[PDB]
């Protein structure tokens with residue numbers, strides 16, 4: 456299998472590009488599974504967090520419980536069948552939002568995640584970058600945006616950072632260009 | 639300052655019975671008391687999540703931990719800060735026994751998760767009601783309860799100042815008197 460993720464602020468085009476990427480792979484005859492966080496593991500976590508505000512620690516731990524189920528019940532089985540699995544958000548979302556955004560320490564986040572994810576990491580992560588005011592109270596969102604960019608510059612072999620303000624088809628073509636060597 | 643006390647033991651061991659008797663006993667002495675419980679003292683909706691069929695044990699622990707994090711921050715630490723005796727019917731040792739010894743999750747990882755979740759908060763005393771496993775989430779069968787029961791006893795041997803191990807099969811009033819005797823010098 457091949458594991459790919461989409462990351463970025465809300466309104467950065469993740470769901471759009473994940474859809475277009477799955478469609479590209481379908482056109483090439485490649486088995487593909489599209490999934491998302493939160494809720495790919497525990498739908499009830501997503502719906503709970505829609506209407507409950509918690510401490511950052513509790514928030515993260517719920518995202519992590521979802522992720523633990525998501526990895527085991529959805530992603531790993533898809534990869535085991537040889538599918539390309541695309542997740543619209545994954546662990547980097549917690550690192551950016553709960554870590555850089557709400558201030559939780561990354562080493563702890565990563566120790567929690569080590570068991571939650573079974574160490575599963577995407578081969579490539581497409582970060583759709585734009586300022587919060589361009590996404591289709593701002594201080595939090597700037598911390599998240601900058602946090603994503605920090606994660607990306609720490610792992611330049613995994614992250615591909617794209618200008619989320621470009622036209623959709625152009626972004627999709629850029630994702631395809633980056634992906635083709637790996638298929 | 640406050641005083642933090644917990645009750646632990648298998649399902650059916652008398653924890654709730656004793657926690658409530660203790661709360662009333664201490665209140666009758668004029669002490670401010672806060673009685674709480676896990677799971678649900680932090681995030682009541684966690685009890686719904688915990689019933690999910692076929693949960694991985696990692697997800698199960700993470701749910702318990704999310705509740706615990708909210709519980710410690712929003713309920714227990716503020717109660718202690720007001721000088722209350724805070725009694726929790728279950729706390730972290732439940733996860734160590736059930737998710738660690740029972741489900742087989744690694745104890746150090748459970749503790750690392752917990753360290754931020756609990757902000758390091760540990761009870762002064764933990765009353766372990768030791769119940770035979772046959773007298774006692776999915777897969778809560780005999781084999782599991784034997785592992786949990788023995789796991790609790792291991793935790794108690796490892797922290798023998800904090801744990802007070804009591805025979806859960808003794809009469810309710812005898813157990814209550816034993817709990818009271820351990821607390822007298824602290825209150």
Ligand SMILES: Nc1ncnc2c1ncn2[C@@H]1O[C@H](COP(=O)(O)OP(=O)(O)O)[C@@H](O)[C@H]1O
Nearest residue numbers: 464465466467468469470471591619621622623
């Ligand atoms: N490159 C783009 N240019 C203009 N509009 C876009 C682009 N990509 C997505 N959209 C539109 O922007 C909004 C957010 O896209 P979406 O894919 O839902 O982002 P996310 O999942 O990151 O929140 C949607 O209305 C979508 O149709």
Ligand SMILES: Nc1ncnc2c1ncn2[C@@H]1O[C@H](COP(=O)(O)OP(=O)(O)O)[C@@H](O)[C@H]1O
Nearest residue numbers: 648649650651652653654655806807808809810
């Ligand atoms: N010391 C005891 N001896 C016999 N039965 C007991 C004793 N303590 C409690 N019980 C009974 O055992 C059952 C379980 O008690 P409970 O306090 O709910 O345990 P837990 O909260 O540990 O599950 C209840 O029916 C209760 O009345």
Ligand SMILES: Cc1cn([C@H]2C[C@H](O)[C@@H](COP(=O)(O)OP(=O)(O)O)O2)c(=O)[nH]c1=O
Nearest residue numbers: 465492493501518544545548549550552553
């Ligand atoms: C996966 C994940 C998401 N999130 C946040 C980012 C988004 O604000 C939200 C996901 O939103 P989602 O459930 O797509 O709903 P909405 O589109 O109504 O925001 O969850 C985290 O904070 N941490 C995480 O680990």
Ligand SMILES: Cc1cn([C@H]2C[C@H](O)[C@@H](COP(=O)(O)OP(=O)(O)O)O2)c(=O)[nH]c1=O
Nearest residue numbers: 649676677702727728729732733736737775
């Ligand atoms: C607090 C906690 C409880 N548990 C289990 C013990 C019980 O089987 C279940 C609920 O505990 P509890 O609420 O004490 O029991 P009840 O539903 O009878 O009121 O959760 C764990 O597995 N780990 C934990 O961390």
Ligand SMILES: [Cl-]
Nearest residue numbers: 797798799800
């Ligand atoms: Cl001790």
Ligand SMILES: [Mg+2]
Nearest residue numbers: 469470471543
């Ligand atoms: Mg989306």
Ligand SMILES: [Mg+2]
Nearest residue numbers: 492493518521
């Ligand atoms: Mg999640």
Ligand SMILES: [Mg+2]
Nearest residue numbers: 519522568571
């Ligand atoms: Mg995680």
Ligand SMILES: [Mg+2]
Nearest residue numbers: 460545547580
């Ligand atoms: Mg990712």
Ligand SMILES: [Mg+2]
Nearest residue numbers: 653654655727
């Ligand atoms: Mg009870």
Ligand SMILES: [Mg+2]
Nearest residue numbers: 676677702705
């Ligand atoms: Mg709990």
Ligand SMILES: [Mg+2]
Nearest residue numbers: 703706752755
């Ligand atoms: Mg915990």
Ligand SMILES: [Mg+2]
Nearest residue numbers: 644729731764
């Ligand atoms: Mg305890």
